[PDB]
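Exercise 7.
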Amino acid sequence: GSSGSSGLHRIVDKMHDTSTGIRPSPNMEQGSTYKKTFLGSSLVDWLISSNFAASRLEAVTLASMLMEENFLRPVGVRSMGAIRSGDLAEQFLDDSTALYTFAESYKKKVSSKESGPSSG
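Solution. The predicted structure, written as tokens, is:
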């Protein structure tokens, strides 16, 4: 309960998609592989391309907004260090280096009495 987004929600739902949603991937900035990660710019541009922002800014904030909602999180390399999740703030760069991933802390259904998928 208690939904503090209203809009971001419609944004997350989109991101949750791969078609019209975002599209993370390993870039390998400086080490690690980073599976399921999208460049900061990828998001910004996305948000914009999604018509959720007018300029990188609106996107930068929209991005930082998702992270707060617990939808995304900062990864290694750019966009890191003094990461604070207290106030809205605008802790988020709009470049290629900067990376971000989806926060596992959110509404994520799970096999609980229902037709489950197969495994490999």
